[PDB]
A = this chain, B = another copy of it.
């Protein structure tokens, strides 16, 4: 079985996706905080680890690295690729986070929700983009609020078809894993979550989960005291 080390940041939504998945699946992992406010993502040493200068970075070891056989480890620098790797590399794990492969329709619904969040909301509202907006003399908060609002609109329309207790029927999936940290992020920029009633119900359902609380941005080792 593989060993896992996560380069993460308490307030990184993409990091939180992995934090949630690890706890849900009962997979132990080693924590390596990277301070994004201090620009530790920008150091040459971290660019060597992840060439996008982003967190999370998942470093997997005790495995056969089929891409670089001489390497003791394998690095996964994008959260959705890392989430699917947990699913594929640990097929006997007691808590699959996708519908079974015999249900490609449900799997596509789950992935569509993940992609709206990970493609259309997070990347255009992250720190790097907010800084580019500020450098143009725009308001990064309004920019981000408008884009998150629009993206949550798309998520809500999907949940109108798929949601039961959770995003897609009555079991937690990768959709819920992506939803929770995106809601934490959207709240930082003053998005009105009540405009999205199903999304809000499902988010609140997830907050009851011990796995989600263990994963909370306010409960990490690198959460500053003032934010705990």
Chain A interface residues toward B at CB < 8 A = 51-52, 54, 60, 63-68, 74, 76-82, 84-85, 88-89, 101, 103-109, 111-112, 114-116, 118-120, 122-124, 129, 132-133, 136-138, 143, 150-151, 153-154, 157-158, 161-162, 168-169
Contacts and interface: CB of A to CB of B under 8 A. Distances in A.
A52 B151 contact: yes
What is the total number of copies of this protein in its complex? Answer: 2
B82 A116 contact: no
18 contacts: A51-B153, A52-B120, A67-B161, A67-B169, A74-B109, A77-B154, A78-B111, A78-B116, A80-B80, A80-B111, A81-B111, A88-B107, A89-B108, A118-B119, A119-B119, A124-B124, A124-B129, A136-B137
A161 B82 contact: no
Given A76-B112, A116-B78, A136-B138, A65 B105 contact: yes
A118 B168 CA distance: 23
A215 to B, nearest CB: 21
A122 B119 contact: yes
Nearest to A103: B66
A85 B112 CA distance: 10
Given A74-B108, A107-B85, A120 B120 contact: no
B153 A81 contact: no
A136 to B, nearest CB: 4
Contacts of A107: 84-85, 88
